[PDB]
Design a binder for this molecule. Structure first.
Ligand code: GDP
Ligand code: MG
Length: 170
C-alpha cells in the first residue's frame, strides 16, 4: 500500500479547541502541556470504509475538506461560523466540502459552564441549532465532539474523509 492522501484544513475562532482536537485525535491523548507554533500540522494514517488513507491536518490559528470549528459553549464562536469562517473558506474554495464541528461537547451539560453562561445571559449551542447552522453554510455534515473525553472525535475525521472519498451525485 498505497494510500490515498487527503488534506484537511481546520479553522475557527481562537480558543475553540482546534489544536487540542487535532492532538487528541492523532496522539490519542488530550494535551496537558503547552503546544508551540512549531507544530502547525499533524498526520494520521487511518482505515476508512476499508480504505487506507493518509490524513494531513492543518492547524491554522488545496484543502480537500475543511473543518469549521466553534465551541458548544461559546455563542460568539458559533455566530462567527457564518459571519467569518464560511465566507473565508468559500472565497478561496467555492466547492470544497465543509464539516461543521461543535467542540467541547463535555461542557454543554456541565453545570458550572451552564451557570457561567447564564450570568452573561447566554446558553450552550444545542444540537438542532448546530444542525441548522450546518444547513445555513452548506456543510455536508454537522458533528459534535470533545477532545478531552474523545466522545465523537473519531467520527469527525471519518466523516471528513468520507466527504472526500464519496462526493455527492448532486
Ligand atoms: N473542557 C474541554 N476543554 C477543551 C476541549 N478542547 C480544548 N479545550 C480547552 O480549550 C482551550 C483552548 O484549546 P486550544 O486547542 O488551544 O484552542 P485553539 O485556540 O482553537 O487551538 C484550552 O484551555 C483547552 O484545554 C474539550 O474538548 N473540552
Ligand atoms: Mg491552536
Amino acid at each position: 500500500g498505497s494510500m490515498q492522501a487527503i488534506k484537511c484544513v481546520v479553522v475557527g475562532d481562537g480558543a475553540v479547541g482546534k489544536t487540542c482536537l487535532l492532538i487528541s485525535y492523532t496522539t490519542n491523548a488530550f494535551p496537558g502541556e503547552y503546544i508551540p507554533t512549531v507544530f502547525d500540522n499533524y498526520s494520521a494514517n487511518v482505515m476508512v470504509d476499508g480504505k487506507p488513507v493518509n490524513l494531513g491536518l492543518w492547524d491554522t490559528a488545496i484543502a480537500d475538506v475543511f473543518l469549521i470549528c466553534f465551541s458548544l459553549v461559546s455563542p460568539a464562536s458559533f455566530e462567527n461560523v457564518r459571519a467569518k469562517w464560511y465566507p473565508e473558506v468559500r472565497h478561496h474554495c467555492p466547492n470544497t466540502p465543509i464539516i461543521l464541528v461543535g467542540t467541547k461537547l463535555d461542557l454543554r451539560d456541565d453545570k458550572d459552564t451552564i451557570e457561567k453562561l447564564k450570568e452573561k445571559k447566554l446558553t450552550p449551542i444545542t444540537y438542532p441549532q448546530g444542525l441548522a447552522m450546518a444547513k445555513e453554510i452548506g456543510a455536508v455534515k454537522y458533528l459534535e465532539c470533545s477532545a478531552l473525553t474523545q466522545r465523537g472525535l473519531k467520527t469527525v475525521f471519518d466523516e471528513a474523509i468520507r466527504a472526500v472519498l464519496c462526493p455527492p451525485p448532486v
